[PDB]
Structure formats: C-alpha cells, structure tokens
C-alpha cells in the first residue's frame, strides 16, 4: 500500500527518483487525516487509463510539508549549504534541471 502512493500521479508529474521514504511518512500521516485515503488512491490508476476535471480535493496528497513537486526547482541558484563564493553570475537562467 506504499508503492501505489509512490507512483500515484506519474513519473513526469513528480519525481523521477524516489521520495527517499518521505512518502511513507506522508502516507502514515494521511491515515489519521482520511480513512478513505487508501481507497481512492488505488482507483485513480484506472480512470486515467469524475476524478479531477471536477473533484479537486484529491490534491491534498499532492500539495502536502511544502514538497512543491520536490530537491527543488532551482537548488543551483538559491539556498535553503553552498560554497562561500556563491555568486557566480546567477548560474543558469531557466534550465529546469
């Protein structure tokens, strides 16, 4: 009941790597939040192959911890860590990764 939440959304709409077991921490916290959390997540796989043209509340597991599709969008330009001469003419501009 963990790998389903790990691959819940997609590889592209999320992390290509693993969550580093924060999803296990997230899922165990969601158990007290929603009893039906474990029931809706499994059905979501079949619908893509109703849920989110109208029902948005399923995004609480997507918003949350910030985890804004996180280790960040640009970790190579802003801190949270880095070398003291951090100034290197802003590194890149819009190269996502």
């Amino acid at each position: 009941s963990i790998s389903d939440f790990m691959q819940l959304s997609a590889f592209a709409t999320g992390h290509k790597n693993l969550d580093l077991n924060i999803g296990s921490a997230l899922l165990l916290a969601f158990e007290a939040q929603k009893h039906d959390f474990s029931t809706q997540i499994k059905a979501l796989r079949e619908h893509i192959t109703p849920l989110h043209p109208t029902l948005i509340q399923i995004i609480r597991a997507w918003y949350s911890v910030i985890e804004d599709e996180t280790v960040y969008a640009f970790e190579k330009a802003l801190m949270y860590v880095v070398v003291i001469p951090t100034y290197a003419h802003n590194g890149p501009n819009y190269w996502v990764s």
Partner: protein
C-alpha cells in the same frame, strides 16, 4: 631570502618559539602539551641578557643537535634535537648567522619550565637519551639513491622532524625505530600512518594529491587539521615546489607498516546514504549541527571548500582520535594568508557546545554512514581526548603518591642488606 632563513622556515623552528601569532616570532614563551606536563619554550632571539646572544657556533650547535644548554643543563626532549641530530654542521652554522643577524633581539623573558619530581631535576635527562641512542652520526649524502631522494630524506627525518610527531613512542617516551612513521597519539590529536602501505598507509594516495596536500593542506580526499594546520601554515607552505616534491619521492620509499586488521584505504572507503526522521539520535543530532556546512548525505560542498565526509582520511581511520579531535577543537588552517576555519564543538565551544556523550553520538553516526563502519566511539573515548589522550605509562610516576611508595621500597633494600 637568506640560506639560513630557508632552513629556519623548513625546520619548523618558528612554530614552537612564538606563542601563537600574537607573540613575537622566535621569542619563546609558547606552551606545548606533554604527558609529563607543560614545557615552555625559552627565548631564542640573540639577546645578550635574556636571550641566547652569548651563544657561539660550538655551543649553539650543541644545544640544537645534542640538546645541552649553555649552563650545562640538559634540554628537554620536547626539542626535536634527536631529529636534529643528523643535521649537518655546514647547515647548522647557517642557522647561527640567521639567528644573530636576521631576527631582531628582544630583552624580554619567558616563563620557565616547572615539572614534578623526578622531572624537576634537569640533569636526569642525560641518562634518558643514552637509552634512546640518539647518536646519531651527522647526515652524509646517500649515494645509492638519486639526488632528489637524498634531499627528501633530509627534509623529513631531520629538517622538518616529521618523525617526532608521527612515529610512535615507547614506555620511556623515545622514538621507535622498528615502527618508523607508524602513527601514534600526540596529546589530544593522532598523526596517522604515512608509510608506503597501500591499504593501511598513504601509499594509495596519488602522487599529485600527496604533493598538493603537503603544499597547502587541502585536498578532495584529506584536509590537514590540528598540528598539521600549524605545520603547514608555518613551515611547509613557504617551501619551494622541488623540496615538497622531494618529500613526496622520499615518502614513496619508506617501508610499509600495516596496522591491526585494515582491509581498505581510509580515503577509498565509500559511505552509505541515510537520512533522519523529520537529542540522543545519531542521524538527527548530526543534522542539527553539520548539515549546513556539509550536506545531508555527507558529500560536502560542490567545489571543495567543505570536506566530503565520504572517503575522508579523518573519518576513514580505525582510531577515531582525529575525528573526535576535529569535533572537539575544529580545524584552522591558513594558506597564503587565506584562513579557513571550523568552529569548535567542545564544552568550551562558542558556536554550539556538545557534551562528551553528544560528540560520541555524532561520531558513531558519521563513522557508521560515512567513515569506516568498523570504527566505533565510546562515551569516555571523547573524554580522553579532552584531557589530552590516554595517559602514557610513564606519566603515572609523575604523582607524589607513587614516588613515596617507591621511596619506601628503596629504604627496604638498605635495611635488607644489613
């Protein structure tokens, strides 16, 4: 610069004769930790009243090489005169010109050495070196090896006295010729093995890395800490490149001395990834202090300012003395007037103080996940480092109780004969 100036810089002579950076160089008054107690360096500027201005070539060499003072007292073994024994007389006389001409004399005294009985009597040291067989014929240029190795042997054994800080001691606190450059505790810190051993020494180091390390003290796989910071920022960083290259060539010819059960090189040991559940937790407590300068995975900085704790010689040693001393005191090096510093984390720390139990907890975690997993740190292991390492067997006799017990034993023999 003067020819004598080069040797004085090379021989680390200015390191022990100035009290840190504040005091005048070569003026003495610098405390150095010894198991017997504290020995204070006496002034060396050629002052006719309170210095050594009355010293001559015959007696300056005797004090430098054979370690006897002008009055007749025996200089303490804290001087590397046993290392300086092989120093050639044609080079020793160069130092005398440098001392009398270059450094400005100061009419300022330095505190005298005070040690408990039987170290109070100075002349007792005369017997000490006889058992240590210091002599010690003056160095003559070796012929079976090339000219570069000849100079490399000159710098390490007798000029820079690298042995006296690395090679171990015995019950009598004397150099051990069998285990040459094997690595032993030096008060709080611990010099590691630097022999040609591939898996247990520094043989696995690349030759370019070794030359860079001795020149500045900063490499991707090792960073000079503690006494080496003083050794590099004072003596080696000013040496010419050829001499440092000569040191590297000599260090490749020293015979290997393996340790007690070593399988992989200290810097070649990789680390396993780990994280913490977002007091008294190895993963969590290390993250509250170290996660900023280093990273959460221990890889350190991207370019190399902060050390990568994975595959690091300070963490790759079986003895965690360097790692515990790194936490308790921090590192402070100064290359070409560019200082890099790590805050101390001891009880007297200024940034954030960690107790002995706390330091062991991070030390256990960092060794388990980044250092050698075989290494383990106990709660009292840190406490020994704070006090200045384990007490040497000889130092136990430096207590008024022990001598009184032995004093009665001598009395027993006198009555026994009667």
């Amino acid at each position: 610069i003067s020819r004598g100036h080069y040797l004085a810089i090379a021989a680390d002579c200015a390191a022990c004769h100035t009290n840190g950076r504040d005091g005048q160089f070569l003026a003495g008054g610098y405390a150095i930790s010894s198991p017997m107690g504290n020995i204070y360096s006496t002034n060396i500027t050629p002052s006719k009243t309170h210095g050594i201005g009355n010293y001559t070539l015959e007696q300056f060499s005797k004090a430098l090489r054979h370690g006897i003072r002008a009055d007749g007292a025996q200089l303490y073994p804290a001087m590397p005169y046993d290392a300086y024994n092989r120093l050639t007389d044609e080079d020793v006389k160069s130092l005398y010109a440098y001392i009398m001409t270059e450094v400005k004399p100061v009419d300022a005294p330095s505190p005298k050495t005070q040690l408990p009985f039987p170290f109070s009597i100075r002349a007792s040291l005369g017997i000490w070196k006889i058992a240590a067989r210091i002599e010690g014929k003056p160095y003559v240029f070796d012929h079976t090896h090339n000219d570069d190795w000849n100079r490399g042997r000159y710098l390490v054994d007798e000029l820079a006295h690298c042995g006296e800080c690395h090679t171990p001691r015995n019950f009598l606190l004397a150099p051990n010729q069998s285990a040459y450059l094997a690595g032993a505790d030096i008060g709080s810190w611990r010099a590691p093995n630097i022999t040609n051993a591939p898996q247990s020494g520094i043989g696995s180091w690349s030759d370019q890395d070794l030359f860079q390390y001795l020149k500045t003290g900063k490499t991707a796989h090792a960073r000079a800490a503690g006494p080496m910071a003083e050794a590099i920022e004072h003596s080696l960083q000013y040496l010419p490149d050829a001499d440092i290259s000569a040191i590297v060539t000599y260090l490749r010819s020293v015979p290997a001395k393996a340790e007690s059960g070593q399988t992989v090189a200290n810097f070649e040991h990789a680390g396993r990834p780990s994280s913490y559940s977002v007091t008294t937790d190895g993963a969590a407590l290390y993250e509250a202090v170290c996660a900023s300068c280093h990273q959460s995975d221990g890889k350190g900085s991207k370019d190399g300012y902060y050390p990568s704790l994975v595959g690091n010689t300070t963490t790759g040693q079986l003895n965690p003395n360097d790692l515990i001393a790194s936490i308790l005191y921090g590192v402070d090096r100064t290359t070409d007037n560019h200082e890099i510093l790590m805050p101390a984390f001891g009880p007297d720390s200024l940034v954030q103080p960690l107790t002995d139990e706390q330091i062991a907890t991070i030390a256990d975690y960092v060794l388990s996940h980044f250092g050698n997993a075989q290494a383990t740190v106990s709660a009292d292991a840190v406490k020994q480092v704070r006090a200045g390492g384990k007490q040497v067997p000889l130092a136990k006799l430096a207590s008024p109780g022990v001598m009184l017990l032995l004093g009665t034993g001598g009395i027993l023999g006198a009555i026994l004969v009667v």
